[PDB]
């Protein structure tokens, strides 16, 4: 007998791990979904089940007289759902916080192709600002590991381009994201979300305004009890 739950950032248990990647272009572990004792086994089925991924990174900059624009943030930015302007986004392309004033800031304009942004408020010459934009390029997939630290096999060895998850408005049924391949967990074993990309992704930014977590991974799945 079986039911449906959702694995997530926190998920079922507080043993799911969240660790960042490396800067050298190499596929590394991002997240580890480990199974607990509470269940018996867990399933995943691409082409049936839904998944969600909003990755967001960190950049940081300093003040000067006459600054409204921030340069290319080292990422190929895509307008979300094929749409650009912020106020009508499903979720922010990018967010800004001045630490001096300790205030979240809105955004006035963007050039996606030039990767640059133009802000509302001129920080002081000698200020500190942090920015959290979405992630651009990269390729990801799922990996299996047993209860020995041993890989066993990837899943449908065709990693997904990152930008698709920005391309599709994830919350729409049918337009939601399904992968390919399959897997069934066991008791102590683990699956990992893996990624190769330039940039380092971020979590747990205490200064972040819109919650406690900046990026998110969610996956509707079937459970065995």
């Amino acid at each position: 007998y079986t039911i449906s739950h959702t694995g997530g950032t926190l998920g079922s248990s507080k043993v799911t791990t969240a660790a960042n990647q490396t800067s050298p272009q190499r596929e590394t572990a991002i997240i580890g979904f480990e199974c607990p004792r509470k269940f018996a086994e867990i399933e995943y089925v691409g082409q049936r089940d839904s998944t969600r991924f909003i990755p967001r990174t960190t950049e940081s900059i300093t003040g000067t007289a006459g600054d409204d624009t921030v340069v290319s943030l080292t990422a190929n930015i895509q307008p979300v759902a094929g749409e650009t302007a912020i106020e009508d986004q499903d979720y922010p392309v990018a967010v800004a916080y001045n630490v001096t004033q300790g205030v979240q800031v809105d955004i006035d304009a963007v050039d996606y192709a030039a990767d640059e942004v133009t802000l509302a408020d001129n920080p002081a010459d000698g200020d500190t600002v942090k920015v959290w934009p979405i992630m651009g390029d990269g390729d990801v997939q799922f990996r299996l590991v047993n209860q020995f630290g041993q890989e066993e096999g990837r899943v449908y060895p065709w990693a997904t381009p990152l930008y698709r998850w920005h391309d599709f408005p994830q919350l729409k049924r049918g337009r939601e994201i399904n992968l390919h391949g399959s897997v069934t967990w066991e008791e102590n074993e683990t699956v990992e979300v893996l990624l190769d990309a330039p940039q380092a992704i971020t979590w747990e930014d205490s200064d972040y305004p819109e919650g406690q977590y900046v990026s998110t991974f969610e996956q509707d799945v079937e459970i065995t009890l």
């Binding site: 307008p79 759902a81 094929g82 749409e83 050039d111 996606y112 192709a113 030039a114 299996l144 047993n146 066993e152 096999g153 899943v155 449908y156 065709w158 997904t160 381009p161 698709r164 391309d167 599709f168 408005p169 049918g174 337009r175 994201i177 399904n178 992968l179 390919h180 391949g181 399959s182 897997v183 069934t184 967990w185 066991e186 074993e189």
Partner: protein, 173 residues
């Protein structure tokens, strides 16, 4: 920890960043440049049924959309770098497409008009008809997607290793 055995028939999508296709920049006035060249991956075989979507997100080097009266064509070629004429899958204006949603809405989505098979060495190319007053093309700011493999919509593309009778019949080209 089970994984699920699979068919040889892997259903995926196709785009520029994969290592069996190569991009190329183009000027403003060339219908002959192979912007994209798409080669057999040497050992697998690919199958593209008719009615497969495409999204040619083609801006200039400034990131802007292009002249209305332009057109696009895709076309198979031989094993020596020369289109075949037949096997073209698409030809009309840019005037229909709307990049902001064109891979999103079915009713705006457009797909292949005819079928296609690909061996281990066959090739396809893509070309771009533009009149005078355009500011060129930029591959790197641009991209292509072919098919879909995550929606429940449109179609994906099949790839296989060599099954015996499958290859025997697939060599009918």
């Amino acid at each position: 920890g089970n994984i699920g055995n699979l068919s040889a028939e892997k259903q995926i999508s196709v785009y520029d960043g994969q290592p069996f296709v190569d991009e190329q920049d183009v000027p403003a006035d060339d219908p002959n440049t192979p912007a994209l060249t798409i080669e057999g991956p040497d050992g697998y075989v690919i199958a593209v049924d008719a009615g497969t979507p495409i999204a040619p997100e083609f801006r200039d080097s400034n990131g802007n959309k292009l002249d209305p009266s332009t057109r696009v064509i895709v076309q198979k070629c031989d094993r020596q770098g020369n289109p075949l004429g037949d096997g073209i899958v698409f030809n009309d204006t840019l005037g229909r497409f709307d990049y902001e949603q064109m891979r999103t809405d079915p009713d705006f989505m457009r797909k292949t008009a005819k079928s296609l098979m690909i061996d281990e060495r066959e090739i396809v190319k893509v070309f771009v008809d533009i009149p005078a007053g355009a500011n060129g093309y930029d591959a790197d700011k641009s991209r292509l997607t072919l098919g879909d493999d995550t929606s429940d919509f449109g179609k994906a593309v099949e790839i296989v290793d060599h099954d015996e009778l499958s290859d025997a019949e697939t060599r009918a080209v």
